[PDB]
Amino acid sequence: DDYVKQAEQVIRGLPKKNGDFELTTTQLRVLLSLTAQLFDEAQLSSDQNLSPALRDKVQYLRVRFVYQAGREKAVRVFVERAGLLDELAQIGDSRDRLLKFCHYMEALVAYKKFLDPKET
Amino acid sequence: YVKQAEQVIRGLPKKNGDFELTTTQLRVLLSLTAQLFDEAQLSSDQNLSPALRDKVQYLRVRFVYQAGREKAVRVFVERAGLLDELAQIGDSRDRLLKFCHYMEALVAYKKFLDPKETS
Amino acid sequence: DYVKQAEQVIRGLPKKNGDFELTTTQLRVLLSLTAQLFDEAQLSSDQNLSPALRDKVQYLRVRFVYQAGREKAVRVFVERAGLLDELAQIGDSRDRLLKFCHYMEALVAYKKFLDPKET
Amino acid sequence: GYAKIEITGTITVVTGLHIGAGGAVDKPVVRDPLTKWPMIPGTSLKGKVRTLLSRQYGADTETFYRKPNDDPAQIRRLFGDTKEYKTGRLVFRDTKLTNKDDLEARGAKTLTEVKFENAINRVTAKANPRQMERVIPGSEFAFSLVYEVSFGTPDEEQKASLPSSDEIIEDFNAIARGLKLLELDYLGGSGTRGYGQVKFSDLKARAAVGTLDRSLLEMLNHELAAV
Amino acid sequence: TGYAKIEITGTITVVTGLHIGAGDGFSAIGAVDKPVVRDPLTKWPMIPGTSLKGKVRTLLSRQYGADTETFYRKPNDDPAQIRRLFGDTKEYKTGRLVFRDTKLTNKDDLEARGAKTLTEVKFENAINRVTAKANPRQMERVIPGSEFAFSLVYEVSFGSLPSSDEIIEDFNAIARGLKLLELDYLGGSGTRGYGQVKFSDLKARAAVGTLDRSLLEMLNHELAAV
Amino acid sequence: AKIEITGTITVVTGLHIGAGDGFSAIGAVDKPVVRDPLTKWPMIPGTSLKGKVRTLLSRQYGADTETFYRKPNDDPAQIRRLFGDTKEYKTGRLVFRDTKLTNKDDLEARGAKTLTEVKFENAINRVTAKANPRQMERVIPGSEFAFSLVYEVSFGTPDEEQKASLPSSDEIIEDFNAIARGLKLLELDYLGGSGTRGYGQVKFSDLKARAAVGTLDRSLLEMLNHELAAV
């Protein structure tokens, strides 16, 4: 349950070869903006155990991460370090992991931007 | 650490004639920390019930994500040392309040050294 | 002379618009709690502070500077009467604390008096 | 005993709501200062229906109604007066945030938004912000009020004039048209910009104490559904 | 069937605010000009037993009346069945119910829940229907979580003495008369979102005197109930 | 005396109404969009919807010969008769609402999923041979909110200087013409802001009217609908 501490070190496992980053935040807006949309109604269900209308909906989020993993090598090592596709197998059991997974996922953006300039 | 609040303003960038941070930059912080410790007062037991040991961990996600903004907030957290004592919170209620009592002493000062002339 | 010199500063703050810009309604959060401090400061038998109350003169102290920055008349009124310094050297005992609770009482009664203030 | 008859009910907001009472948050809701929840006072529910039910019975057949006490009989019957005073008949309970849990369990966390705004002056189209903190639009409040058999304490010579059921059953239409327009109208500040569409739900009268007959009270609820 | 002083415990608690006021007190801070009935020493909010008399005096005179309909125009015009508790100049009687004062008991828990100033300044307003002008005011009331103790006694028959049933139904007349006040206002600014109170733990005992056996649990019935 | 204007609003373009700071601010860009704080659906605020109608009407209902209407309290007295000011202390007769999203259980079946999209834009600034990135956000143009507002008439008197400032059944039609020409340009101007970028055109369907309370003229409220149905 302490995986918010895990995001402090699994961001440093990103291979940063120039001295700079290579997995900048800009590539991730097709990832982090689509996990928000299921999250907003996941809490809205009063039932703990999910409906089959909600078990199948996470599956599109799963296959878009493997589309990105086949797209970009940076995402392919981003997944298998923090084990996203590993935790996305038993995420069809109940939402408490699905709640803890996106809670983990929100922590991955944090120290990533902490080392990024982000001037607009 | 109320005297630290006068001390941290002696390091923030004001050489350009004006100030960098506001209460508007750290506004989303104040919608969370003020909501937090007013649920800690009604807590009768000393150790935090698990319903808000993640809510203080919700903040620790937010603070560094808010620290990932423009360099006005870059000076602010580390000259305050918010994060360095924010991981310490997870067990007992008392200095959780003094954590909030520190930043409430802080945000009462950090935009509030003459923002109307912006000086 | 602390119970008279609150007059040449309740005069000394200026109003040119006809009405006193420092309303007495502007202090109903500083002076609804400084009553609650005074109601248990005097019930204390010891000369020094109780341990549960030296934070109370600190918790009140930031509310002075927080409501100082939130307004513009209070922004200059407080340090011109110097309530930051008289709260700086107050943490020892109730010797200077009950000077403070009657220094504000010298200032709320004067500010009621030097206004028309229909009620 | 011809005693007091309790009307329960439930208000639920449909959009945000903002009852000012004055972090650097400028315009809050009325904060119930023990539990720091949002509350709805019984004063912005009496002083607002008196601005509507004294513009429905009155202000249609040309009544100016310049002061808060020139109001008609069937208003100053209920809402109380200083002059005639049969009985002050509308005790309004203050009320607070009922479902703190379901507002927390179903996702929302901070219990009070900071909804922004902006000013634009067409001398120079310059932006001046504004922040109107409202209630969460699903914040349901409980809603209670008590009626009574309203036995008159008269300044007037009509001594011991007890209201019977026919005077009572007029008032439930005044309960109906009191809140029927109130669902259509505001409650809170930031006037005529959309805040405070509310929906009064589950309205029920209930003979809490008294000797009310069986036939009456179920017909007194018939006005309550007419809104 | 000898002597009895039935003492009544319990804890009243404000649910809403409460603005039972003192007119011209001596609190001297500002818009405490609408004060609450405070203690003079501790300056903690309290409740006079006059009001707890003068609400159950009033709101049972129109509940035992306004059914018998004769309006009971003066506090001797009330029937015996109220004034044999509350007192009259007609029979010169001493009352029979010493409604005691009570003050702020749990100030300690109110510092545990972080409640800061013990008296919250509930603002209100005046809107005139032609001008639509806001005339404000600064009305002041107690914290809506605070709790006061509850203490009344009830002397037994002395004058050739009220029998067993006169103890029973008249004590039941209190509990009938008390649940009215629970659903009624108590403080000042009635009918407008103030002055509602909550009662709890209301039991009888034999604090002194030779109280009987059957005639106590009947009195621990309704007052524990309502 | 109250008469509610039932309606429905449908967007056809991107809409970036309201950024501020971010209520959620986790999954969005540095320029966010407002959202229903219980459910995170992009609402429409009743402020800019009033903040557009008042500022579209300082061109057609005035500003004829270099009169700025430099602050909108200097509006003509028809605008004060609808909105209100501190000039006459009137309550206003145009009470809006706050309108949230409605077709959540329709947009997912019409092939749209993400409920909003960050359309990447450029800023080609010729300084040091670059095309500046910027990532403003739009909303789905197949999304339908709802619409309502109520008109109210104080038939006793809404003011103080005269004992009668009420509208009878004659003043309503110039107000509905000011509703007609009010919502007219908004059907071809951007509902939100950040203009000259293809934003905020909406088509009001079913813009009918229902009398909330009272008895009205049978012919009136349907010829009033002509000024509703025109725009």
Side-chain angles (χ1 to χ4, degrees):
Chain A
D1 53 16
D2 57 7
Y3 276 180
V4 195
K5 182 47 93 153
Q6 274 209 150
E8 183 145 50
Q9 46 77 20
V10 302
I11 294 177
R12 312 174 167 120
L14 161 60
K16 312 159 266 190
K17 60 185 74 65
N18 189 275
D20 309 338
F21 277 103
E22 63 97 10
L23 192 44
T24 193
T25 314
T26 304
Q27 292 104 21
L28 274 71
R29 298 292 176 183
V30 302
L31 292 85
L32 51 87
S33 317
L34 280 81
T35 172
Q37 321 300 317
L38 220 59
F39 183 39
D40 300 353
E41 54 84 24
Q43 273 174 328
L44 255 52
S45 158
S46 41
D47 213 9
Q48 171 48 277
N49 49 1
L50 282 304
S51 90
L54 261 183
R55 306 225 171 270
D56 53 357
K57 286 188 76 177
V58 68
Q59 177 58 21
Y60 172 64
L61 296 87
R62 177 168 214 177
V63 290
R64 225 177 184 286
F65 290 159
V66 317
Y67 207 53
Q68 284 281 146
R71 172 58 182 88
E72 181 48 58
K73 65 158 214 304
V75 193
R76 190 142 50 89
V77 79
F78 194 20
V79 178
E80 283 292 0
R81 268 194 305 266
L84 284 69
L85 262 289
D86 301 330
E87 317 289 5
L88 258 66
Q90 80 303 334
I91 200 155
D93 168 54
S94 201
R95 43 175 275 175
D96 316 324
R97 287 233 161 177
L98 164 59
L99 269 50
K100 267 290 308 169
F101 150 72
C102 52
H103 285 336
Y104 181 44
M105 177 48 228
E106 301 181 330
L108 271 295
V109 199
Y111 320 96
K112 172 58 220 83
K113 192 72 61 152
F114 195 33
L115 279 305
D116 185 283
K118 182 88 210 62
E119 181 176 356
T120 289
Chain B
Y1 307 138
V2 180
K3 187 58 62 183
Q4 292 192 29
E6 180 61 88
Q7 273 151 262
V8 54
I9 216 68
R10 294 287 179 266
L12 264 77
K14 292 199 62 51
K15 29 209 168 183
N16 46 353
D18 39 356
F19 197 76
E20 313 294 312
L21 202 52
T22 53
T23 194
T24 61
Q25 306 194 27
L26 51 91
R27 171 63 69 198
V28 197
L29 284 75
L30 308 178
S31 175
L32 273 293
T33 178
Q35 178 45 60
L36 188 45
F37 82 110
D38 300 338
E39 306 195 355
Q41 311 295 335
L42 190 39
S43 156
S44 316
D45 308 70
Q46 169 56 249
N47 47 78
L48 281 304
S49 201
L52 75 159
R53 324 174 82 122
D54 43 352
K55 290 186 33 71
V56 59
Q57 211 57 43
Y58 281 161
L59 263 67
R60 193 184 174 187
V61 177
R62 262 63 167 247
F63 273 91
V64 55
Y65 187 22
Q66 292 305 129
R69 295 308 182 276
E70 210 282 330
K71 300 298 144 203
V73 78
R74 174 66 37 172
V75 62
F76 157 70
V77 180
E78 57 85 27
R79 289 305 209 278
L82 303 170
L83 266 290
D84 310 61
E85 302 282 85
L86 206 149
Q88 202 251 2
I89 302 310
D91 45 353
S92 156
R93 197 253 294 272
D94 305 273
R95 82 276 195 186
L96 156 69
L97 308 187
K98 194 46 197 79
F99 150 71
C100 312
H101 294 350
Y102 175 50
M103 61 200 317
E104 284 197 339
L106 218 71
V107 303
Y109 197 73
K110 303 300 106 190
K111 194 256 275 181
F112 298 140
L113 275 194
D114 195 5
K116 285 99 178 179
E117 209 64 38
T118 325
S119 89
Chain C
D1 195 50
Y2 282 160
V3 194
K4 191 258 160 191
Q5 271 190 355
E7 185 45 55
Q8 58 94 26
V9 304
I10 206 71
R11 287 193 180 101
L13 65 98
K15 56 103 172 181
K16 316 301 179 191
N17 309 266
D19 197 1
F20 264 102
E21 84 292 339
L22 196 148
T23 66
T24 302
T25 65
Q26 212 160 349
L27 301 177
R28 298 293 185 236
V29 74
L30 300 182
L31 313 183
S32 171
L33 265 159
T34 323
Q36 192 56 44
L37 170 73
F38 182 75
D39 296 343
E40 301 317 305
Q42 301 272 21
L43 267 288
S44 86
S45 64
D46 55 341
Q47 183 53 47
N48 53 1
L49 265 299
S50 164
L53 268 75
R54 194 177 296 112
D55 62 327
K56 193 70 66 68
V57 76
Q58 289 264 43
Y59 164 64
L60 269 288
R61 171 191 155 179
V62 295
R63 300 302 309 272
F64 277 97
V65 76
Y66 164 55
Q67 303 283 114
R70 193 182 177 186
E71 320 305 316
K72 199 59 172 68
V74 194
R75 197 88 189 96
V76 63
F77 165 74
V78 173
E79 87 273 15
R80 278 199 288 176
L83 277 80
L84 75 169
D85 309 308
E86 293 270 0
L87 275 175
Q89 272 93 28
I90 213 162
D92 186 306
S93 171
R94 39 185 268 161
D95 45 6
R96 284 100 69 203
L97 181 65
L98 308 171
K99 296 166 29 178
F100 152 73
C101 273
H102 303 333
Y103 196 26
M104 56 81 92
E105 207 53 54
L107 285 155
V108 60
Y110 279 167
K111 198 48 205 85
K112 279 287 192 82
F113 184 77
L114 275 75
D115 196 82
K117 200 50 198 74
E118 81 277 54
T119 316
Chain D
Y2 276 93
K4 281 75 193 161
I5 309 303
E6 167 188 30
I7 305 173
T8 181
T10 292
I11 177 170
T12 174
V13 303
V14 199
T15 177
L17 187 42
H18 179 39
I19 308 190
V25 48
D26 304 314
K27 322 278 189 314
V29 192
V30 278
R31 313 302 287 146
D32 168 38
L34 177 67
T35 81
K36 313 298 196 281
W37 284 359
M39 69 179 326
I40 287 297
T43 312
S44 281
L45 198 146
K46 185 138 174 174
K48 185 55 151 209
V49 176
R50 207 181 160 92
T51 319
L52 297 182
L53 211 60
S54 274
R55 269 193 294 188
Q56 182 260 299
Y57 280 164
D60 263 358
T61 79
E62 274 301 325
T63 63
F64 188 65
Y65 281 163
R66 61 191 313 278
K67 66 176 168 59
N69 219 340
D70 45 39
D71 294 302
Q74 316 163 189
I75 296 319
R76 302 200 270 124
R77 272 162 62 193
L78 314 182
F79 284 5
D81 60 271
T82 80
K83 296 175 294 183
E84 47 184 356
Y85 198 75
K86 273 75 51 187
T87 34
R89 280 143 62 158
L90 261 289
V91 284
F92 275 154
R93 296 302 177 196
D94 207 311
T95 174
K96 63 158 166 293
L97 181 72
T98 292
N99 48 354
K100 179 53 212 294
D101 48 356
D102 271 19
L103 211 154
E104 190 45 50
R106 284 180 168 101
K109 43 190 61 182
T110 195
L111 210 54
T112 287
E113 315 96 341
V114 177
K115 163 163 175 315
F116 274 173
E117 265 153 23
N118 189 16
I120 285 292
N121 43 350
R122 279 85 50 84
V123 193
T124 173
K126 198 63 180 67
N128 282 16
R130 186 161 168 248
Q131 55 273 13
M132 306 315 297
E133 296 81 348
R134 316 180 307 160
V135 82
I136 307 307
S139 317
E140 168 180 356
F141 308 100
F143 168 72
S144 180
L145 68 154
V146 195
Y147 206 64
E148 62 264 51
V149 192
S150 315
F151 171 72
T153 162
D155 161 75
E156 41 266 32
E157 82 283 348
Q158 306 170 359
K159 295 295 183 301
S161 305
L162 173 77
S164 299
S165 91
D166 315 339
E167 298 187 359
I168 277 177
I169 211 168
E170 185 262 327
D171 316 325
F172 282 83
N173 172 76
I175 292 149
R177 315 284 89 83
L179 73 92
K180 180 172 170 303
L181 290 92
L182 184 71
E183 284 186 352
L184 299 162
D185 210 335
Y186 266 20
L187 283 178
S190 179
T192 73
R193 269 83 63 87
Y195 302 176
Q197 159 83 12
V198 302
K199 172 160 189 34
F200 274 81
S201 320
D202 260 348
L203 277 305
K204 265 164 294 305
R206 160 180 190 149
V209 54
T211 63
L212 274 199
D213 43 342
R214 176 64 199 274
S215 50
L216 184 62
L217 184 59
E218 271 62 36
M219 307 273 128
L220 308 176
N221 316 135
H222 279 40
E223 276 90 358
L224 263 60
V227 310
Chain E
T1 61
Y3 197 80
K5 292 219 61 170
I6 295 97
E7 210 274 342
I8 292 309
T9 80
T11 41
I12 86 169
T13 295
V14 283
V15 280
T16 62
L18 191 92
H19 185 40
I20 164 168
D24 199 297
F26 42 90
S27 317
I29 212 78
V32 74
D33 73 316
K34 304 310 288 286
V36 196
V37 181
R38 301 185 156 280
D39 195 276
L41 192 48
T42 53
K43 298 100 168 181
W44 297 355
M46 47 176 256
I47 285 304
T50 312
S51 306
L52 299 174
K53 202 176 188 64
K55 216 68 182 194
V56 191
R57 186 57 169 169
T58 293
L59 309 183
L60 199 145
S61 49
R62 66 188 56 171
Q63 213 272 347
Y64 207 81
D67 185 81
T68 47
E69 194 46 37
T70 69
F71 172 69
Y72 291 148
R73 49 202 65 251
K74 279 179 175 45
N76 310 268
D77 198 24
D78 300 334
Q81 282 73 251
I82 323 181
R83 77 201 157 111
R84 79 164 60 106
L85 292 182
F86 284 73
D88 49 337
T89 40
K90 271 169 166 165
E91 281 207 1
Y92 263 122
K93 285 186 288 194
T94 178
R96 211 161 64 242
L97 279 191
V98 191
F99 286 82
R100 315 204 98 93
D101 203 306
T102 177
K103 66 170 303 184
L104 187 69
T105 79
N106 51 352
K107 200 254 174 168
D108 51 3
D109 301 334
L110 261 67
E111 267 305 312
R113 282 95 177 97
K116 297 296 184 266
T117 178
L118 191 42
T119 45
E120 51 97 359
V121 188
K122 176 187 183 306
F123 273 50
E124 274 187 4
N125 208 301
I127 287 293
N128 40 3
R129 264 88 60 84
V130 285
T131 322
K133 190 50 205 155
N135 215 46
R137 50 174 169 167
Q138 296 194 340
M139 191 169 270
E140 184 257 313
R141 78 195 188 160
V142 82
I143 286 300
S146 42
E147 155 171 318
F148 312 109
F150 187 73
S151 58
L152 70 91
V153 306
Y154 165 82
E155 281 272 355
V156 78
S157 317
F158 64 98
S160 302
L161 80 167
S163 176
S164 45
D165 58 335
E166 195 37 72
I167 315 296
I168 296 154
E169 51 87 21
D170 210 9
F171 214 83
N172 214 327
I174 314 168
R176 160 163 75 259
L178 193 46
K179 56 170 148 76
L180 312 173
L181 177 52
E182 194 147 37
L183 58 87
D184 207 297
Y185 275 75
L186 192 142
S189 309
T191 74
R192 220 183 312 163
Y194 281 84
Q196 195 200 0
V197 285
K198 176 82 207 72
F199 273 47
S200 43
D201 318 329
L202 300 169
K203 68 209 75 181
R205 73 147 167 267
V208 78
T210 171
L211 198 44
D212 301 336
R213 185 55 211 270
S214 157
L215 315 178
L216 173 64
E217 271 62 38
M218 285 187 193
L219 307 192
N220 272 321
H221 271 323
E222 47 263 20
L223 186 51
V226 293
Chain F
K2 307 199 63 79
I3 41 170
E4 70 99 15
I5 308 304
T6 321
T8 301
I9 177 172
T10 311
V11 64
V12 305
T13 42
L15 185 57
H16 201 64
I17 175 63
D21 54 64
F23 184 72
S24 308
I26 291 295
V29 309
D30 45 37
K31 299 158 166 50
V33 59
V34 304
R35 256 174 286 258
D36 188 7
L38 176 49
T39 46
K40 273 72 146 163
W41 301 345
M43 67 200 320
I44 287 303
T47 75
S48 300
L49 181 49
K50 192 181 194 196
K52 185 59 73 176
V53 172
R54 193 152 171 151
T55 196
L56 291 193
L57 263 55
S58 162
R59 282 171 276 274
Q60 49 168 352
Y61 278 61
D64 277 320
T65 304
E66 208 67 29
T67 76
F68 276 167
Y69 287 155
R70 75 276 184 193
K71 295 177 286 293
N73 47 17
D74 317 306
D75 51 343
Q78 169 59 27
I79 314 288
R80 307 170 144 108
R81 218 177 67 176
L82 301 176
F83 292 162
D85 276 321
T86 172
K87 198 64 68 176
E88 78 279 359
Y89 291 171
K90 261 181 68 181
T91 179
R93 311 204 294 250
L94 264 289
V95 285
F96 288 79
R97 291 300 174 219
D98 265 347
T99 50
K100 68 178 182 66
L101 208 54
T102 324
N103 56 326
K104 172 51 74 150
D105 71 279
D106 173 60
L107 196 83
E108 86 283 22
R110 223 197 300 183
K113 284 281 212 93
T114 172
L115 209 69
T116 182
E117 177 273 351
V118 47
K119 43 182 208 309
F120 198 91
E121 318 292 292
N122 206 334
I124 301 190
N125 220 306
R126 337 277 297 176
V127 179
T128 311
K130 73 194 184 317
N132 213 6
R134 82 164 177 268
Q135 325 201 51
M136 283 147 184
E137 173 188 17
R138 71 153 159 160
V139 72
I140 301 319
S143 43
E144 306 218 41
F145 323 105
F147 189 90
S148 181
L149 65 96
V150 192
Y151 199 82
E152 195 254 329
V153 283
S154 156
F155 213 77
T157 303
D159 267 330
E160 213 282 325
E161 196 265 343
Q162 187 34 253
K163 333 281 182 166
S165 158
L166 67 147
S168 68
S169 178
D170 52 339
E171 321 200 3
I172 320 292
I173 306 100
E174 191 193 359
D175 307 334
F176 272 64
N177 193 3
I179 294 174
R181 296 216 261 186
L183 315 176
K184 182 187 287 184
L185 164 52
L186 175 144
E187 296 279 313
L188 60 93
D189 210 50
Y190 36 90
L191 183 136
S194 277
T196 54
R197 285 161 195 91
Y199 282 163
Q201 297 165 167
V202 283
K203 299 324 170 274
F204 298 150
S205 66
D206 314 286
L207 202 42
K208 53 187 170 308
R210 192 194 76 234
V213 283
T215 66
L216 269 300
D217 298 331
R218 169 63 258 153
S219 88
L220 172 75
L221 76 165
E222 45 161 0
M223 49 82 69
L224 284 181
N225 198 21
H226 307 338
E227 293 90 9
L228 301 185
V231 303

